[PDB]
Every structure is written in C-alpha cells, then in structure tokens.
Amino acid sequence: MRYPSDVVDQVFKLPPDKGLLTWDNDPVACSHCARPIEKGDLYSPSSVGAFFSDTRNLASTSRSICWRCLILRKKQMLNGLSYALITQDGVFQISKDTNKAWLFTTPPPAPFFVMHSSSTMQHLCWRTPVTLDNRLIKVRYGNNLFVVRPEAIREALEIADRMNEGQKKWQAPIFLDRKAADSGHGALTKAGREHLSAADQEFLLNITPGERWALAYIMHSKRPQPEEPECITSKILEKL
C-alpha cells in the first residue's frame, strides 16, 4: 500500500458508495489521507459535523473526501479498526499484549498500518503513515504518532533481563505507562538509576516515545509469549 485510504480497495475491496460527486478541477489532495483527487475521481464535500475534533490532523483545506475515506469514516470502520493491524493479507487485532509483543519484536515484512485508540473510538484510519520497512514501525496511538524500532525494543528487553537476572524480585528499570499519561513516563526508576551501568542508562534515556509505549506493553515480570493475531477483516466486513 501507499496511502492509508489504500486499505479499503486492497483488503476490504469495498465498492464506492452511491451518489458521490465527480471531480472536474485541478487535482487537490484529500482532506484526510492526502491522496490526490484527480479529474474524474469520486469525492464528496466535507460534512464531518460539530463533533469532529481532529481538525489538526487534516491533510489540507480542500474540503474534499475521497470515497475510500468516506468508507473509512463509517462507525463500523472506526470501531472495528480501534486496535487493528492492516497488512496485505488482512486486518489483524493487536489489542492483546501478546499481539503487541509479536508486532514489536517480530514484525511482518510487508507494508502495514498499525492502529491503536486511546479512548472508546477515535479517527485513526486516515492518520497513520504507512510502515514501509519493519525496522521503522510507525504507530498511531490516539492523537500521538509513534516511531518504534524493533531493535531498540529488543535491546531494552535484554537490558531489563540482564538487570533483573540476579535479583529474585523482578523490577522494571524504567517507569512506563500504557496510557502514556503518567508524569514519570519514560524516566528511570530507582532500581534503574542505582543498579545499571552508564551505557544502559544512556540507552534507556535516549529511546523514542514510541519505544517507551511499546515497552509499556511488552516489558513485564513475565514477558508474554508472542502469538499471531487473528484475522479481523471478516468481522468488520460483516458488521458493515
């Protein structure tokens, strides 16, 4: 895939809705997924309504929405893709911690989109940049766009295991929060501050926010075993 809207016609294969206008002016980017809207394509003027609180993430002021985004803005699409991973084969659910560990330790090779919501249901279909290479995974968490490097996650897990190797009571070296909301998120704990070497402390302080978020779901006393997430595109298509 190339664009967030490309997930529709490639893994959902949903035909465009009826009654959509046809573009007849100089091409302009979509207001959601930044896809160009060329002459002869199907679009619709923006009618997001007063309850749309994602104006800051709009690609442009074209006020035009391509049919793929019009599909992606349906309630069944927003709810189904709350904790989704959209790859070529299908849409997978990464809600469970084991799924997150598998994704951030053994990512799929193909381009994919990573979905995650910080509340009941949020606009995430059209805000996630594509992950071209598995070594640089871009994850959209609520209003935060994260960059996760699997090698950094593996190195941090190795550091935590080596620091907790001797002590019988397991204790995390770095303070992390699943919601990425705590005031101490990403800061070293007392055990990390006074039981780790200078190189390990410098590495743990110099990780990206996305890596902290991922370790908040992976790094624990009993590391979850990675497992393949289930196929979810069937459920979303049936509910639509």
Partner DNA sequence: GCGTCTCGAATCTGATGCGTAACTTGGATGCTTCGTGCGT
Tokens representing residue 142 in the block: 């609520």
Among positions 14, 63, 74, 96, the unique one binding DNA when judged by CB under 7 A:
74
Q: Which does 54 bind (CB under 5 to 8 A by kind): DNA, Zn ion, none?
A: DNA
CB closer to DNA out of 193 and 239: 239
Per the CB < 8 A criterion, the answer to whether 53 and 212 are in contact is: no
Per the CB < 8 A criterion, the answer to whether 31 and 58 are in contact is: yes
Binding of DNA at residue 63 (CB under 7 A)? no
Q: Which does 5 bind (CB under 5 to 8 A by kind): Zn ion, DNA, none?
A: Zn ion
For the residues of 118-174, what is the DSSP string, one character each? SSS----TTSPPPB-STTSEEEEETTEEEEE-HHHHHHHHHHHHHHSSS-SS---SB
* Least distance CB 230 / DNA (angstroms): 24
Q: Which does 66 bind (CB under 5 to 8 A by kind): Zn ion, DNA, none?
A: Zn ion
Helix H or strand E segment including 91: strand 91-93
Q: What residues numbered 56-85 form the site for Zn ion, per CB under 5 A?
A: 66, 69
Binding of DNA at residue 57 (CB under 7 A)? no
CA–CA separation, 219 and 70 (whole Å):
38
CA–CA separation, 236 and 125 (whole Å):
13
Q: Which does 73 bind (CB under 5 to 8 A by kind): DNA, Zn ion, none?
A: DNA
Alpha-helical (H) ranges within the chain are 6-7, 67-72, 75-80, 97-105, 150-163, 190-193, 198-205, 209-218, 233-239
CB atoms within 10 A of CB 183: 7
Please name the residue that has the structure tokens 């294969």. 13
Q: Which does 32 bind (CB under 5 to 8 A by kind): Zn ion, DNA, none?
A: Zn ion
Among positions 7, 8, 11, 30, the unique one binding Zn ion when judged by CB under 5 A:
30
Binding of DNA at residue 119 (CB under 7 A)? yes
Per the CB < 8 A criterion, the answer to whether 86 and 7 are in contact is: yes
Among positions 20, 34, 48, 145, the unique one binding DNA when judged by CB under 7 A:
48
Q: CB under 5 A: which stretch of 32-40, 86-94, 142-150, 195-203 binds Zn ion?
A: 32-40
CB closer to DNA out of 121 and 136: 121
Binding residue ranges: 30, 33, 66, 69
Binding residue ranges for Zn(2+): 30, 33, 66, 69
The residue ranges that bind Zn ion (CB under 5 A) are 5, 30, 32-33, 35, 66, 69
The residue ranges that bind DNA (CB under 7 A) are 48-49, 51-54, 73-76, 78, 118-123
